[PDB]
Amino acid sequence: NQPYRTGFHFQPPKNWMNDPNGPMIYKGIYHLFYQWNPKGAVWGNIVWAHSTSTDLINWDPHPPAIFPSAPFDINGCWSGSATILPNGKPVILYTGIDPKNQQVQNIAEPKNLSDPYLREWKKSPLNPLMAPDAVNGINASSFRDPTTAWLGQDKKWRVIIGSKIHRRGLAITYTSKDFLKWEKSPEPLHYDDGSGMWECPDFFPVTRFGSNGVETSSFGEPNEILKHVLKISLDDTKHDYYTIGTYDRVKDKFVPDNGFKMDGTAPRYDYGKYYASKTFFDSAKNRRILWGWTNESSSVEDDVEKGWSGIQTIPRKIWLDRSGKQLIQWPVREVERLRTKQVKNLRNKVLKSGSRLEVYGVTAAQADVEVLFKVRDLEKADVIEPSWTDPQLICSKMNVSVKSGLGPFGLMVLASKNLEEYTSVYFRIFKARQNSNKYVVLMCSDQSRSSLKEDNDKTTYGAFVDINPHQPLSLRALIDHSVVESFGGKGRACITSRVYPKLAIGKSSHLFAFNYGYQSVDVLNLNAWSMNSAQIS
Template identity: 60%
Template structure:
């Protein structure tokens, strides 16, 4: 466990029950099964605090949210369901909240689509996915909790009126459940069914699970989408990874950036398997080959298949879900960012959790990883623009980007440098460390050779607070290594906060001696996309000085090599329509 996390959590002791504290400490600061804080689950505030609420990210007017569920496109509308507590700002009383949008940016809310009401989900309606059938109608699969022992089964729901593009009402047929855990399955670790795909007339779904410390994606097949049978073997499993939550399995094209329907296969396709790790609260994914005859998935041998594997996001990002958008032939990724403050602070402010900006995902031309980029519709929120061109940054320089709302902005910058000669040597001992640990040693204030250089986001005027997002280039034995950091340690003078130095290495060609960075800054969240979306990091931060109009934005360089801001465009971001009720 990160020492910073332990220190922050110990400060919560006066306000947290001891059992809750111990549970959080054992799970990296984020609740796993969420069966905690019972006394707080139905405590709501009269007035929601606006400080740190986001301006253009997805969130309801108040209360707790977590996993994005069942995203889909239907009859001209995007639908997002998500886990929501309608009664308080901690996990509990969970329903499937429901919102719709025409552009993925402006959202209207509907009544909850799914909530506990039947014997097969009376103790909880947990995460799941949506599938569009060949006749064009959607079906939701979700996990139902059936008793106080947390026994988990899989159910389905269908629209009451499929001609309604808003899909206002959902029905849970009486022939539920569709999947029971057999005696060989851990019934309290059997959840989060995937979007279904079809091969040779049979539908398939995955369900996340574990057996002791082995993570498992169980495979089930069906001819009619109602009667499901467990395959003899899982699609995939990995020893030592623990519970696999929110699995996602989908094809990506070997050529071009267009997305594919989940059932597409063939020689021009690779497959991606993503799992959310309950033990670490990180996600990882692999790219590999799906053998349709054997119903087996084989990750590429060059990739790490475990805790140290590739991640969509090396920061605060969990329980993600993709879907295929047929209107624009793209695959879109949703992810949840939890709070990094205390439970007591969440209850005081009256809300917790956001969904991050939806991202388009596709296969990098190298085939080694995925690329991600915010959906283009986000750019409709851009308003006033300021620019920097060919701004030299000598060692120790920080230059303010003035004229925008620095607390609510979109920044896109290209840095260039004349040489790689001053890159610091990469310590061979770091090869065994997480990038986060390297960033902890080599932060933005530690002078270097080529870097650190980047942005100081959500900064106070005198830099008592700032969240740096920066690159640092190292020279390893056979190549250069690029580190991208989003370091929250200096983000706030407030107490009781988890402030980690999130980081990831960037697999990028430095032949042109340039690095690009795009950061979406929104009051308490900074989403950063390095090198065209090769490495992405999300930080949640809570400044107490650098808020609203007192927030500033700087470019900086703390390396001995002079860096040039070749181009920088920054925009103030307007507020979208965010979860106002749909007019009847």
């Protein structure tokens, strides 16, 4: 009936969803709001829907939290963020579409703070708190998505809003003493020429060595070393980008570390289908947690026909990696509670050239699988072409039927029994240079043969992974009917994808480990769990 609806990913009962909104924790209860069209399978009439959780996995529905109810948001309630004030009170800053269809920034706060589920929200008669006008000269059609606010050393709040001027992307900074009167700062927190619109900006601290989250307003003590992360979703490319840098508190400006530029050349959280992502600080278990919207890769006709569009990926804890060159992401550990009690284990199998090994006894369309690969002869790896710089484009031209020294090896997920349909999540290993000991690990999510229906967007994804192939290669896949979430190298490379198979559904989907490279690769360990369904809104 609905073979592509997910078993444990967040999505509403029906209709269009996009950006996650105002993720927060309050009185030990997680809140996710999200952009939702109450009466269609495409974007429009957008309101904030609302669901609550105590584990980030099972979700209880609530009435729409924020919807048009006043001039300043009469034409729509667009994206925004929750800030937890020092006294413990949550407030929401969000973009409203006003009566002249200009984008403006409004505040909402709880109607009853004793209500843990914060079902009803009221809005200030002073709204909008921040808006375009003749003096600031901000572009009224490119001025949205307020961040969580952070309290500076001088007791004045900061908040940034995504914007642009011509081809230049902006993170417009506003400051405030009381959180009601906001004043525009002359210079923005950062900008970039040529990037285009900066949608859904995020700005947060991270500790230099460690995996715990840092409270957004937390300072770097004469012991503690914090970097800051600026994230932007770019209109232009439909992807999410981040740079690692320092936060000049004197200038109130963000300086990306040498090598970083905040545009399309920057690194991504996810190298597949992933947009409008937003973090929040989970004070209950000390971790920053990242929400991400994954839209459909089916046709709009298929969307309208099935009656829904859009999912959230599984929430992932994030932190700075040891080297400080990238962020590491990993699905929140609560997702592991869905894992069936009886794991399927393979250990010490040799996938010779051209082989595949099927993994039996698992609900293959709804599963979590972790695998370790060990290559024996690294020196047999092919020298990468120095002009091959774009990992996605490599995966596109070198498909799984094209052999190399090391790889393709990995998983074939959501596969039919006779492999009429399959999604390949695999590795290739290249030698960085001739006679070198440095190696390049490529990760591909190939969905060229994921479905017999051609209407589906069957674009392939790629990403290089900063891991030493001398050590075993890690690979985790969350599988859920129409979504595959892949994590290379224990979270250093993430690729979310959407697939819609005709044969590989429910009991008729299968799971294979495989190797089509010239050399043989070992599978040190392969754990495949069936995943139970979550109770979701």
